[PDB]
Amino acid sequence: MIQRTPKIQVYSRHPAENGKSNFLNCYVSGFHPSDIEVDLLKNGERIEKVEHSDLSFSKDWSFYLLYYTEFTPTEKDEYACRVNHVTLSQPKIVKWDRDM
């Protein structure tokens, strides 16, 4: 059966500024099948109020989802997205890097 690995991107809606409310996004795209586990992490712990978009797919049939939460960036707090999928032999963690 076809399987396609999620391309995972973690990023803020607006340019991050310590002390200013923003949104943290985990966008996962290009995957198949549609069963996927995605979590936003703060200092390694799962964030609980996380919303996500309705399942949709691209021209090539692969699926995409956006996970997101309101957050306020600080110098100390670290953010990440943890994803599990049949193509990933272990859960994969991508860290938010605000300086790209």
Partner: protein, 275 residues
């Protein structure tokens, strides 16, 4: 100035955990405006854009009935496909369907489409003339025979040429301010050393709509396509999109490298430079 309306439908079997999961979404261009999810509490087709909210209760009741009817057909299909491919009961399978229409900048019909996939690959699709089918394998030829005997393409053509583009028109006008806008990308490049002899140059485009955009790196004017990392265009969450492309370059050679951005909201394509 060109537009599209498209509906996307996904159904996934979960044998021994009940009925197949069913999700339907509709988009005008890159803006979602409706959804249905089989597992949600409401059991209703629901609005996902402010401009669709003005539709009356006949709209909502009708689309709810139609989408639940699509759900049932996919539930049947999952059964039928297992038979066509002699597959077992204890594996999850996926059916996907998408259809819709495109119109030009003058809002006249360009193209129609209606296609189906099983387990992530093409199964059957209406051809460009909307009168015939492309079947991807032998099982899909069986569907083709059944759909030709049932004159399915003719009913579909009537929708894609008439109804589809009538409603797309209506939506484009009700949703004028958000659907007929163009937000040009706000662009810049970043520079970061990865060691004392190389640097990452990254070309950024932010806050743009629609999502279509090209970003490319040149070195002394020649494309660096095989050396470029280009990410998937991603939603900001607020209705606009973001994209970046990066190259890793020897330090000292930055001024040979330019980033080029093409987008429909730019008066001219931009060239960004390191000098």
């Amino acid at each position: 100035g060109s537009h599209s309306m498209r509906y996307f439908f996904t159904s996934v079997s979960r044998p021994g955990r009940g009925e197949p999961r069913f999700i339907a979404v509709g988009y005008v261009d890159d803006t979602q405006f409706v959804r249905f999810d089989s597992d949600a509490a409401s059991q209703r087709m629901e609005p996902r854009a402010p401009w669709i909210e003005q539709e009356g209760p006949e709209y909502w009741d009708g689309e709810t009935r139609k989408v639940k009817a699509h759900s049932q057909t996919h539930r049947v299909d999952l059964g039928t496909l297992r038979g066509y491919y002699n597959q077992s009961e204890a594996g999850s399978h996926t059916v996907q369907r998408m259809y819709g229409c495109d119109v030009g900048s003058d809002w006249r019909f360009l193209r129609g489409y209606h296609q189906y996939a099983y387990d992530g690959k093409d199964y059957i699709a209406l051809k460009e003339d909307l009168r015939s089918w492309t079947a991807a394998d032998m099982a899909a030829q069986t569907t083709k025979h059944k759909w030709e005997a049932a004159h399915v393409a003719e009913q579909l053509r009537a929708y894609l040429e008439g109804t589809c583009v009538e409603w797309l028109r209506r939506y484009l006008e009700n949703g004028k301010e958000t659907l007929q806008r163009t937000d040009a990308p706000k662009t810049h490049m970043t520079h970061h050393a990865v060691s004392d002899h190389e640097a990452t140059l990254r070309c950024w485009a932010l806050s743009f709509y629609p999502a279509e955009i090209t970003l490319t790196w040149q070195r002394d004017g020649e494309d660096q396509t095989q050396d470029t990392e280009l990410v998937e265009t991603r939603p900001a969450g607020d209705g606009t999109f973001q994209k970046w492309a990066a190259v890793v370059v020897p330090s000292g050679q930055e001024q040979r490298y330019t980033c080029h951005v093409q987008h429909e909201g730019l008066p001219k394509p931009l060239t960004l430079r390191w000098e």
